[PDB]
Design a protein around this nucleic acid. Sequence first.
DNA 1: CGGAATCCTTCCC
DNA 2: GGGAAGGATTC
Length: 342
Amino acid sequence: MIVLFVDFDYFYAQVEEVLNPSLKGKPVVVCVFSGRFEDSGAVATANYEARKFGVKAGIPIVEAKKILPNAVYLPMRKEVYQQVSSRIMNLLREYSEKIEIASIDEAYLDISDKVRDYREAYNLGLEIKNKILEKEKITVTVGISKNKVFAKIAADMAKPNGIKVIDDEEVKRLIRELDIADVPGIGNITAEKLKKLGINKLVDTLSIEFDKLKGMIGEAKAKYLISLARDEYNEPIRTRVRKSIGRIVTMKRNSRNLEEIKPYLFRAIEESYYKLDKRIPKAIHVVAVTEDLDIVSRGRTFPHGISKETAYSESVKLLQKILEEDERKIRRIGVRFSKFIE
DNA sequence: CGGAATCCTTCCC
DNA sequence: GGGAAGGATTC
Ligand SMILES: Nc1ccn([C@H]2C[C@H](O)[C@@H](COP(=O)(O)OP(=O)(O)OP(=O)(O)O)O2)c(=O)n1
Ligand SMILES: [Ca+2]
Ligand SMILES: [Mg+2]
Ligand SMILES: [Mg+2]
């Protein structure tokens, strides 16, 4: 099993750079504007120029502007980035049928039947990099290992505009020296627990008990690290299908008033149905973010597809249902559709 | 105090 | 033995 993983470098920011070459060299920050206050929202991605100074994904725009007042701040153009992504994803299919596309910017390729060793798995890697650079002007990072996780760790270590193989030795060598928060699927809320638990490196997942580990972080995560540590993990490359689509909006002011909210809910429906595009959902969930910032939802499943009219009808019923079971004032309202037919 | 979507735990009448 | 409402990761 030889796994080759491609992650596009600082994607949104890079597409912007390609589309506007004057942006070459300066800090560029792609933003999600929430719309409550002007400049309310979050940085989605910054190019390396901006990163260098602390402007990174997830931080408030206001914060980013305290650090780099004169950076170029742009709104997200998901529809412009997905064009480029879809094109590159097709380009990658010319190498492997078994291709697992995990995000707008990431794909795994099981290239076992295609190459004979890591040497010339590396060479197929460069052929992949160059072809993207010539075709799209986008630079990518290639990660290569025995399984998906390590192929990805390889990519992280080698970015941006890089290529890295991790053989069976390096795999053993990484099991004992990689920080735990650098393992894919392990984010902040998990990585901080293990700190207190004594766990820092991946090898530590056998330094102490399983019930001590499973007790804090859960069966599937505790198992996951163990199987990686024991050098056992091997999930196959699988074609992924989008499972759900939705849209959440922030209201101008918090409310419990059903009639004041309806316009926001109906707007979320309209955007969701534009996003669906001839995908027909069987389930709708109304999602409501509290004044306390807690996430509350209530859904419904149908034996059939949901016309936009039923969506309008049922969303209200579900909103009313959230109203009867909550005291607080709603800040953010949204809708989620799932269980597609066809 | 952002958006989006995945793959887990999770008790119900 | 489901369901549906929840976490957490990532985007
Ligand atoms: N709090 C966060 C964190 C991340 N992301 C998103 C923005 C990125 O577009 C995406 C992809 O993650 P990558 O690690 O691939 O980051 P980038 O592609 O932006 O840069 P790089 O590839 O150099 O890491 O995750 C987000 O929306 N909100
Ligand atoms: Ca994505
Ligand atoms: Mg990526
Ligand atoms: Mg990337």
